[PDB]
Amino acid sequence: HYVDWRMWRDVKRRKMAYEYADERLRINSLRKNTILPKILQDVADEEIAALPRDSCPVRIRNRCVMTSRPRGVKRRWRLSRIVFRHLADHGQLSGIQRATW
Amino acid sequence: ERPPRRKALPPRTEKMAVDQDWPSVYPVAAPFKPSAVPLPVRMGYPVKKGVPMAKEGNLELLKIPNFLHLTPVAIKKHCEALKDFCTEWPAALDSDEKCEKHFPIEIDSTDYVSSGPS
Amino acid sequence: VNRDTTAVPYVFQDDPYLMPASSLESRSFLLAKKSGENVAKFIINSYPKYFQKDIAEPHIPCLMPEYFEPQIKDISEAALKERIELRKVKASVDMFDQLLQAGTTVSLETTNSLLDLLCYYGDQEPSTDYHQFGVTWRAKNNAERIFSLMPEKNEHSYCTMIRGMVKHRAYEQALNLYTELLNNRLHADVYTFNALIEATVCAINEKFEEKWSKILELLRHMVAQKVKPNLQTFNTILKCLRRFHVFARSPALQVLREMKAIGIEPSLATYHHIIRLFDQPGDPLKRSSFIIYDIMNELMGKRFSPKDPDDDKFFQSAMSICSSLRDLELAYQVHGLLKTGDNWKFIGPDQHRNFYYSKFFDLICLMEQIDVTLKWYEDLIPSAYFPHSQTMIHLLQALDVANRLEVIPKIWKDSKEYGHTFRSDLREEILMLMARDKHPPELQVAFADCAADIKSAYESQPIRQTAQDWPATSLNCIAILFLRAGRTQEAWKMLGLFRKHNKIPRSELLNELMDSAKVSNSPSQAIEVVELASAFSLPICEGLTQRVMSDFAINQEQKEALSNL
Amino acid sequence: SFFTKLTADELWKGALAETGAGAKKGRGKRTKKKKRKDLNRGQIIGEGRYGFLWPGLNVPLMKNGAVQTIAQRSKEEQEKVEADMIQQREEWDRKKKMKVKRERGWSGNSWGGISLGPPDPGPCGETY
Amino acid sequence: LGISIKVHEPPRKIERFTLLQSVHIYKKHRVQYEMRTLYRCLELEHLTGS
Amino acid sequence: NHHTYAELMQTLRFLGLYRDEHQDFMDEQKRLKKLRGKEKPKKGEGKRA
Amino acid sequence: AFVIPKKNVPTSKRETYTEDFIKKQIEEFNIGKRHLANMMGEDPETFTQEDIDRAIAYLFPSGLFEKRARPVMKHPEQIFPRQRAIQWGEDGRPFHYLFYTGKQSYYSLMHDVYGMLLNLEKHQVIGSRWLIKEELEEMLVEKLSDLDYMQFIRLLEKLLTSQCGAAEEEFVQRFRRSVTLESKKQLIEPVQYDEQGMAFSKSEGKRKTAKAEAIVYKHGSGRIKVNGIDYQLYFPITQDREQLMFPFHFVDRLGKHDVTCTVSGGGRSAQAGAIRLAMAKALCSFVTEDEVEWMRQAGLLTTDPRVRERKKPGQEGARRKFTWKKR
Amino acid sequence: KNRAARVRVSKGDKPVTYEEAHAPHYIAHRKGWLSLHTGNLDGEDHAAERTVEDVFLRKFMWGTFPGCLADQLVLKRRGNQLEICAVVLRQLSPHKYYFLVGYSETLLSYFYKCPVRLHLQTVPSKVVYKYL
RNA sequence: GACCUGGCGGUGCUUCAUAUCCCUCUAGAGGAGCCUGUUCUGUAAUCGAUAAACCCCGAUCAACCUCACCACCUCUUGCUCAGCCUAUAUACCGCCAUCUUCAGCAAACCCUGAUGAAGGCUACAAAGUAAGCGCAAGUACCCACGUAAAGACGUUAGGUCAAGGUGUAGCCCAUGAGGUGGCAAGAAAUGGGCUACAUUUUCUACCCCAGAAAACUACGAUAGCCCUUAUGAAACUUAAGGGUCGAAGGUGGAUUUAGC
RNA sequence: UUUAAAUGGUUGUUUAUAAAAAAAUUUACUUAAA
């Protein structure tokens, strides 16, 4: 019942990334320093690379929650510029008015 | 349809005396009810050769956060009931210099009141 | 803040279209709102998934879905305890049987908990959202079967069984079980003894003296077993003593005197039972007079807390006696007690509240000055209750006695707003009072406007779907009120209605129609008055016709008049 | 998605295409014009596909002087309600399909010789 | 209630942001929105916990 | 959670408590396409093979 | 018969307020006025229209920029538009001999003025502005053309130019309104005295985003201190120092006053311009009124309104446009 | 030409309410906001969740009271409370209104885990500001 | 044949255009390098915009993801009481461009033309009265100024089925869904921008009273090469810094943009 | 009165009506008996 298959793929990525966040944080800490031996850091390099691809947080996309538009989204409202304007121009967003100065 | 359509009763502001206890009508914060507020208040930008819209079915008056439950009479009556909960500031600590001598440490904390489920 | 008299109760929607306009609408509008809440709750519990996202901080347990199904599927004693906590009578009994067949041990406490569930609900499922006369106890019930199955039976097991039987009207069987309890040398608890008192009175139809001896014997058994009586022990005795109304009066007072000595403080229920016992259909009410006065002196300025399930029934009974004695000062004391502290919460359900206020306002109108009656009228209606059509008649009678008939038009307006527009009794009373005597011009005009509105109500009757009736009196009164106010045109139309509906006009209406015609000096109209009465064969017409013939009558009309008779 | 659903007024305004560039300069023919159909006409509040009987909405609040409880129409009973609803729609639709016999003037598609009825009455109680 | 209160008005904050006016192309055309946050600072003094 | 919103409002429609004007619109269109012959084919047993 | 779809109740349905309706609205205002006094705990008998407006503003707080859109509780006479009474009776005969002209009020007035001129002929300023058109229409409760207004004013001028009697002058004054002429005279600052008894005058200035406060002492040696620093150090650029000298040089009082100023915000030039304004306004206290007028006419006492212009979307700058491509 | 939320002039027979008669450039000059919460104030959180809730509530109420609403909702949030102010018509029976108020208040409180109230104002017919 | 209305005229007269049509004023573009679009060519390898009114345009943004593309592989009541970024913007809603740096569009009536398409003004007045909409007035920003905003009816079947929704037609073991990998280049041309060609300059101090530099070690790359770092699971590629390197360029053809 | 200033593929323009309807409740405690 999500807007489209693209939104559904992003929903799964956000879920898998959440599940693996702690494990990914722990392994990255082993890699992001010069204290530990390079042999150990090399094994950590492989371990984080073997985790499922959809656990990688960089693959998450901030799509419009209403229409799934991948660009033109305002992060504070999580809405596309077209949907945000529809709500703002009808006076349905608290405190948001047209700017003239 | 056996009977005629149900007819709305006349507004109960016509039964209100001009010396009523208004705080009893609006005890707490409530939306503006044109049938309960005995004021001919009008709102709305008037059309050419027109007048601001009447209060019945007026969505602009419904949008205002009114202060009908916080009239000067109600506030004074409210605070009279709340004096029992208050304690008296120590008379010795008249000035800020006196406060610093007896209480050198000052702890600042902040509380945030927002609207929402959390 | 205080109650707003112009408003209906706060539970209702504060809107002219949605505000209840009658006592019936008051009940139905709340029932509809409650039905909506049940439908929502039904959906919430049917589909918990949709209401499992908790966004509240702090967490609100009450706004979460409820799960009524057992989540332990293993057959064990611990898993059985769940079904008893869930009050699944059928599931628990079936599982208990399966547990017993498997041969695992069920603790006495667990078995006793099952008996409590079975005994209280009579081996019947408690009511759920969705899937009177006679003895509900059945010989082939699960409680009895399990009771025998029990290997060890403690005092609590017998107790809950006795209480169950009495609750379900198995009085004789409960008494037999108590005899078995005594044979086992097992002490009964206070709650069992309270149930047993009820059993002895209800079981047999012996005369009072025998029943009193039995009750006293149980009290002596209670003392022998070192069982201390609670408030309910005495309240049941008084409630049981209501059957023998004239013989239990003095004994009932002895029971009350015993309570005070022991230290048990009589609650509102205790006094409710007493006044009901002492207040039977008798004209003197001499004993009742003393009791109520003494009770009110004791209860003056006492804040009450819920102690007995019957605490809510005192005020309606107290006000009923005040109306019977016709003592307004006593009624004000009863109401004063209701208004002290939080005693107002003991008024009871809606039908109790309507009765209390009906009896209270009917006594005010009768026994108090009109100026104060109108103050009570404004405070109580509509904010406290919606008046019955009979209470408006009492208020009209009070206005008559006080010679304040300028308010009658207002009473009609309020009556229409309270759902009495089409009450025949009320409409006939108002018209009769307005037309009984002549009034000054200003009052006569106002009465005509009210009469025209009452007339319009008769025309637009919803009973028309069945049959439309114009009571003879109403028609006569309306016509007279139009004639006295000077709307002769409107009155002239009413003569068509009299013959149409076959209603005989009174002589006073005909005699006064003369002046209207004489002032006009239209002999044609004068004959119309004669023509109508002649149809009904009224004796006044013949003598009347001659006087009209002397005053104003056309020669040709005179001859016709005589032949028409 | 529940959040992508529009109202009936918006759906019909788009589907009908009454305001466009194809209706300005004789750019479109008149045959394929479609008509608006109000889909709320025969719908009753509280009536659904499951057939639940909500006391005080779908059914009367009180029956025999007692508040009714939530009930559900049996399978066969709901089938009748659903079949009746289909029949009611077809009848309503039939009424619209019926053509009223229009008295023709000089020719079938000609306006000449067709009566326009009585002249409209004047503003001061004048009648023709 | 006997409290010592002093009121002053901190300066308002206006947040402005720009959006595209058309659904597709026409970059030169923009709609600009604002949110105005006004303030009032009520400063009580010499109070007790109760 | 678009599942919760969609599934809740679909259940409330089948219960008779929510009128979905949009879903009503696409149910009338889908109904007129059956009378016109533009019906969705059986899965697997399609035009192609 | 082919039935023309009949018109519904006129949609426009222009609202007319009959005199009885206005009377019912007045009763409502008077009754509402007593509740509003009761709500606010004031005397019903001394509750004025300015108290009503204050109470309504508190009870119904509206931030709408346009005041005509805010909640209002005014006397119906001030709310509802003034409507002309019925001009004909039951018989149908109009009440005015000039009714059929359509402008009985206007043409009756024109007739009166012409008559007065005839009688006057047979018998023989700065503050007041001729009543404007929109305000004359209000008096007559008639809709006039611009050329009709001209005609009427021309006739009044003819009346005024000729000699008039007591009565004719009063009639003319009915159509003359009062103009309050603002004085372009500088407001002098109040000379203060410090702890030592030395006269000084504080003033303020503003230029772009800079704001200066200057204290000019009645007597001094010509010392200027900017933010506690000698002016030649704080203003190395000669142009800035030239601006500081312009106020004192123009009144020929270089070396006769000591100034202490504080300037914050803006750039070097804006700060010098802000200080120039602050010093000039403060120095007005010690110069003569005529010298103050010369200072005003020389540009030394006007706040320069030229501030930076915002940038507009779709353009390179405030006025600069993006490169235009015909093809 | 601008289109956003503008009812366009017709032949003078289209009744418009006061809300729909004002274009977006009047949202803080002649008309107010249909929702009041703190999400969009400076330094305030959860503007996104407040917005989604508003969009749902407006659709829920439109379908729950089909054909009854005479104008747009006014959504009010004070602390934990949510108050829905609806101007409805006087066509549906009062019994059905009371059922729907009890049903919607309960169902919405369990959905958004907060006390929800519904304040109905009845009008005989849609309030016409002007005929466009 | 004769007319009505509009358009158009290298059509007359008169008055004008205020960043404006000409004469004028200032700084630029067109030449060079680089950055970024577009067209062509190339590639197994998206789509849309594309006189004024496209060309740092949908994107307030593409290493995977985004993605809609290509190759290969896999799934079949499928996240959904399915799905489709499949065709049709010449079926539409929605949101807009444009004249508009306009002032007109007008329902309802009345009158003129012999009751034709149509037309309706003269103030010392001769048939027009006109609701509504736009302009205006108000409001936002620092004023009554200015700038924003606003800007009707229509014109270009103007832009957008790929924001989303949707009429009609089509696919349903595939025109739907998922996985892995991969393409997004430069023969060439061209739009916009950035940095320069220097002495009103370059470097350092300072933030305006200085000392040096100043033509093959000058001015001049934000490019190339190497190294390091930042983000990331992934960087020859994205960004930042350092080193190294020191090129074209010597003020630019026809032509052309913006500013009161 | 007064320089020169050519071109623009084919077919695609304007008629018959208009509009739903409803609904039942049916004003007054407690108890109790056989």
Ligand SMILES: [K+]
């Ligand atoms: K022409």
Ligand SMILES: [K+]
């Ligand atoms: K150049």
Ligand SMILES: [K+]
């Ligand atoms: K489509």
Ligand SMILES: [K+]
């Ligand atoms: K360039």
Ligand SMILES: [Mg+2]
């Ligand atoms: Mg990303």
Ligand SMILES: [Mg+2]
């Ligand atoms: Mg034919």
Ligand SMILES: [Mg+2]
């Ligand atoms: Mg610039």
Ligand SMILES: [Mg+2]
């Ligand atoms: Mg624009």
Ligand SMILES: [Mg+2]
């Ligand atoms: Mg170049």
Ligand SMILES: [Mg+2]
């Ligand atoms: Mg391309």
Ligand SMILES: [Mg+2]
């Ligand atoms: Mg293309």
Ligand SMILES: [Mg+2]
């Ligand atoms: Mg990619």
Ligand SMILES: [Mg+2]
């Ligand atoms: Mg890929």
Ligand SMILES: [Mg+2]
């Ligand atoms: Mg595809």
Ligand SMILES: [Mg+2]
């Ligand atoms: Mg198009």
Ligand SMILES: [Mg+2]
């Ligand atoms: Mg295209």
